[PDB]
Amino acid sequence: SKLRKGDTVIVIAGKDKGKQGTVQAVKNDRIKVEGINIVTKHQKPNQATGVEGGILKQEAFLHISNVAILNAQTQKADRITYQFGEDGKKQRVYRSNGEVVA
Amino acid sequence: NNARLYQVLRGPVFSEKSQMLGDSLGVQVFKIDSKATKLEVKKAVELMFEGVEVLKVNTLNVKGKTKRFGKNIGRRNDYKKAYVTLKA
Amino acid sequence: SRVCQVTGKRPMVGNNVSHANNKTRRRFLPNLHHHRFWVESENRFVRLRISTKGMRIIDKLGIDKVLVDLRAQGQK
Amino acid sequence: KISELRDKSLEELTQLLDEKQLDAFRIRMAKATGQLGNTHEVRVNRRAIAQLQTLINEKQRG
Amino acid sequence: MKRTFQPSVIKRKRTHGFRARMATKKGRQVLARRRAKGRHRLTV
RNA sequence: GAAGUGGCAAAUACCAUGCUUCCAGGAAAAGCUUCUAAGGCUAUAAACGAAUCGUACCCUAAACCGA
RNA sequence: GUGUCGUAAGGCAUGCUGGAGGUAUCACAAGAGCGAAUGCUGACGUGAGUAACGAUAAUGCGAGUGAAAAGCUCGCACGCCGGAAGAUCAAGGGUUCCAGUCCAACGUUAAUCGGGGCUGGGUGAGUCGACCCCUAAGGCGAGGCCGAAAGGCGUAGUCG
RNA sequence: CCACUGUCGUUGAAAAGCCAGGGGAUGACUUGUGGAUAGGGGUGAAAGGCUAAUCAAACUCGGUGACAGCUGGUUCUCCC
RNA sequence: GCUUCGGGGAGGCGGCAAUAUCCUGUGAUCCGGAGAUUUCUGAAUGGGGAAACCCACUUACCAUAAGGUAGGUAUCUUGUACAAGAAGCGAACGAGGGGAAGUGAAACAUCUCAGUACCCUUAGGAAAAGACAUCAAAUGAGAUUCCCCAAGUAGCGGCGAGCGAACGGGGAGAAGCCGAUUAAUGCUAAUGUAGAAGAACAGCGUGGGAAAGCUGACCGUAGUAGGUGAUAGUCCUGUAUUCGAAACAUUAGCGUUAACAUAUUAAGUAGGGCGGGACACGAGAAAUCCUGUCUGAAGAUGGGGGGACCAUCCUCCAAGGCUAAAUACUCCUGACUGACCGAUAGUGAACCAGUACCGUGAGGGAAAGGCGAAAAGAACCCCUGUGAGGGGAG
């Protein structure tokens, strides 16, 4: 839940360790990041729908603990904490530095 | 009441018997509410298709078929259908 | 049932005991009888299914004192 | 949706509920005959009827 | 040859059915026992 | 675009819940017709109705009772 | 599997398989050791490719379809029932009814066929039956009677 | 509706049948539907018959893990 | 699934099980409190009935046709033809009314089993009991209940098999009263029912993948948690720690209200005869308690008990009612645990199980878990009947 759709993350575990990307989908404990963890799907063709078929290369879900949010300044893997702004706003901040943005 | 006649007619029947009856004797076949009487079917049809007059309502209950799926034995809903004759 | 109205005497359980000490379940029944009691204060006879112990109680206490207790206790 | 329904009179809530039941019948006929592409109007209409009956009960109770 | 079952719905529902069970203290104990075991079929 | 009416035979079905006999002496209650008790009805029609449930199919059987 | 070690129960090492756990030592506790109990459960043998394929009313052939036809469809012929092996129900069953489609399993063989799979369809009543009104046997039974309790009986009635 | 004889069948087509014969067939008959009688109880033109393929005491559950001076079985090793 | 009050913050329209149309920062899905709706059957309650159906009567209103909306209509009990209750279901534990046999006695009848199983009635969070007409016999104690002893003792017993105390001691808990009752209502405090934050790891080699190896760091009121592609205090969820409630529940304290109760010292009673039962105690020399039957006092100058009975002495006042705790239990809720099992085990049931199946019925009653880290679940080609099955490819 600490990583949302749209934020850039760094892969810290698995075959695609060290690659960056934008989060496409977050399930309960699994995350999908564009450009990383790409599988080959043998899509069986069908006329009922508009998809042609063939051999496809699509990104697969991986465990959410294998990715970390990417620090926008230090360009390194970082953790996420929360800040209770007295103005009444709960924003994610980076654990290392601590700035509001993402 | 008028809020009961809206729920009487559940949908037209589209089959060869239906099409033949509509072509030849001009009768409408409807799926109707399982608790609906012939008088309510008359009132519902005349209310919801303005400009038509019902001559006769013939109704029947048809039992749902036992259709299995996977490891289960289910069955379809029962339903009631009406044959409605109209003043041509 | 076979219960005295005024005393609550009901069948009691026990044993038939033989000379060889064989024991068989038995009952002891109340000495219940149907009796019409004259009530002066109501100018009427009231018929009660009563034991003889209850009849002696009516002798000693009076029919009114027992009838009021029956009515308080219930069935009347 | 419920915002522009809570400030409606009892009479016009009844009059709108009747129209919604008529619309439910029309949706049923169109879905049975195949003239209902967006197949979520039936769900939304049924939920709106439930809302209208809830509000009618509230306004008839208090 | 003639066999033992020889079915009849009126007889079945009148000797074993829900109302015949409910009409006696011991039939209600039958039903309570069936419910405690959790049977999907209470009565014939 | 045709015919379609005569003879004869003939049920265990119908007349007949009859008739005749016998002793072993042959349901009940309602509908119905009348009479009143306490306290609308009969003819004439005219218009309009008669709800609900079953109805498929097997049934001397491959579908019921016999695994 | 192999080698090796111990009097034995057994130990150790290692090839292959396997793919995520194991356990020295000394104590401690046991659901602690299986060939038998006509033991229990599952699997799989022998018998054996043996008996049988369920009324001895009976089939032949030509076409068609099909991957394939003795069995399906059509045709010709033949045979059987015909107080039924024909027809209408009730009871009971519950979709087995009809069409299209499929043949794995089911059908004691094959199956293109089917009461099999799948997907659609099909049952229309004032007069037929039920419901309904009435009651039989027999139930239940305001009150009532009886009975340790539970209950048993029974009147008016109410069902059947 | 029965069940006298025989053959067959006896891992049956069938947990009582088939075939050829046999008996009653207006009666103390046969049969449909509903109802009543319930276990030391019922019912029995009486065979201890029958009471759901169960009967000199039904079935199910419980007492219950009945008891069994009886039969069976009783599992690693070595030393005295 | 509708409304609302809170929480929460980016996904979501429950599972097999996806697809489609879509919803969602104008805050969805989701979680918690409250409310609305809540078909029919079933105590089923308007009458009936083969449960999920048939048939009604009536009041008010609406419609004008053959109906609709909102109600009322069971029975029994208690109150003045009217109001309030009850009913049925459901674990064990309590109290009560009835009450076996198998078995043991190496047979069997007394006896045992056992006041058990079972049937039946009926409560409460417990119940029952309970304040001396009790024990004791010591220098006396001081209600009831439960535990450890006393003690397998004293006894009972075809003196067999067996059964089996009490006094008193050490403890738990303690309480005595004359309403120690029930049910609402309002304040006060606390709790519960959603939540929030929550530290600290990099490099190198191996490897499909690192959490394991080597080197060097850091947090710790957080280091033996579950996961993550192999074994993680520093990757995630967490943990230590610190914390939130609009609403409703519950617990306690105070106040008020309304229902019931509020004895005044106890006669058909104590005692007795007969027949039984209970007492460890089987009639026994049998006290004591209960009572079916038949009787029947004294009544404080009196009466009960102290194990036949009498005297003396001691003790206590029945025939009015109540009373917390310590004790019993688990259908269940929360937390936590296990030298408990790990798919023939553990529940019968890890899985669509009280199911399939068997039985008229009561009832009996199974089998059946695991691809992979991720479906990346094998596009396409070939043989085949567009089948199965396979071989390539991936």
From TrEMBL, chain A:
* Xref: PANTHER family: MITOCHONDRIAL RIBOSOMAL PROTEIN L24 (PTHR12903)
- Give the matching InterPro entries: KOW, Rib_uL2_dom2, Ribosomal_uL24, Ribosomal_uL24_C, Ribosomal_uL24_CS, Ribosomal_uL24_KOW, Translation_prot_SH3-like_sf
Its keywords, alphabetically, are: Ribonucleoprotein, Ribosomal protein, RNA-binding, rRNA-binding
A GO cellular component annotation here is: ribosome
Q: Is the keyword DNA repair in the record?
A: no
Q: From what organism does this protein derive?
A: Psychrobacter urativorans
Q: Name one Pfam family in it.
A: ribosomal_L24
Q: Indicate the family of this protein.
A: Belongs to the universal ribosomal protein uL24 family.
Q: Name one GO molecular function term.
A: rRNA binding
Protein name (record):
Large ribosomal subunit protein uL24
Task: Specify whether Transferase is a keyword of the entry.
Answer: no
Q: Which gene encodes it?
A: rplX
List the lineage, top down. Bacteria, Pseudomonadati, Pseudomonadota, Gammaproteobacteria, Moraxellales
From TrEMBL, chain B:
**GO BP:** translation
The UniProt keyword set, sorted, is: Ribonucleoprotein, Ribosomal protein, RNA-binding, rRNA-binding
UniProt GO molecular function: rRNA binding; structural constituent of ribosome
Any one annotated GO CC term: ribonucleoprotein complex
Is Ribosomal protein one of the keywords UniProt gives this record? yes
Its family remark reads: Belongs to the universal ribosomal protein uL23 family.
Subunit notes for this chain? Part of the 50S ribosomal subunit. Contacts protein L29, and trigger factor when it is bound to the ribosome.
Question: What function does the entry list?
Answer: One of the early assembly proteins it binds 23S rRNA. One of the proteins that surrounds the polypeptide exit tunnel on the outside of the ribosome. Forms the main docking site for trigger factor binding to the ribosome.
> How is this protein named in the record?
Large ribosomal subunit protein uL23
- Please give the organism: Psychrobacter urativorans
Q: Which gene encodes it?
A: rplW
The shown residues of the full protein are 2 to 89 of 116
From TrEMBL, chain C:
Q: Name one GO molecular function term.
A: structural constituent of ribosome
Biological process terms in GO annotation:
translation
UniProt entry keywords in alphabetical sequence: Ribonucleoprotein, Ribosomal protein
Q: Name one GO cellular component term.
A: cytosolic large ribosomal subunit
Q: Which InterPro entries does the entry mention?
A: Ribosomal_bL28, Ribosomal_bL28/bL31-like_sf, Ribosomal_bL28_bact-type, Ribosomal_bL28_sf
What is stated as this protein's family in its record?
Belongs to the bacterial ribosomal protein bL28 family.
UniProt-listed PANTHER family: 39S RIBOSOMAL PROTEIN L28, MITOCHONDRIAL, LARGE RIBOSOMAL SUBUNIT PROTEIN BL28M
Name by which UniProt lists this protein: Large ribosomal subunit protein bL28
Source organism of this protein record: Psychrobacter urativorans
Tell me the name of the encoding gene: rpmB
TrEMBL record, chain D:
Q: Which residues form a coiled coil?
A: none
Q: Which domain of life is it from?
A: Bacteria
Give one Pfam family, short name only.
Answer: Ribosomal_L29
The UniProt GO MF terms for this protein read:
structural constituent of ribosome
Biological process, per Gene Ontology: translation
The answer to whether UniProt assigns keyword Ribosomal protein to this entry is yes
What InterPro entries does UniProt report for this protein, alphabetically? Ribosomal_uL29 (IPR001854), Ribosomal_uL29_sf (IPR036049)
Q: Which GO terms describe its cellular component?
A: ribonucleoprotein complex; ribosome
Database matches in Gene3D superfamilies: 1.10.287.310
Q: Indicate the transmembrane segments per the record.
A: none
What keywords appear on the UniProt entry? Ribonucleoprotein, Ribosomal protein
> Where does the signal sequence lie?
none
Q: Which family does it belong to?
A: Belongs to the universal ribosomal protein uL29 family.
Provide the protein name. Answer: Large ribosomal subunit protein uL29
Q: Which organism is it from?
A: Psychrobacter urativorans
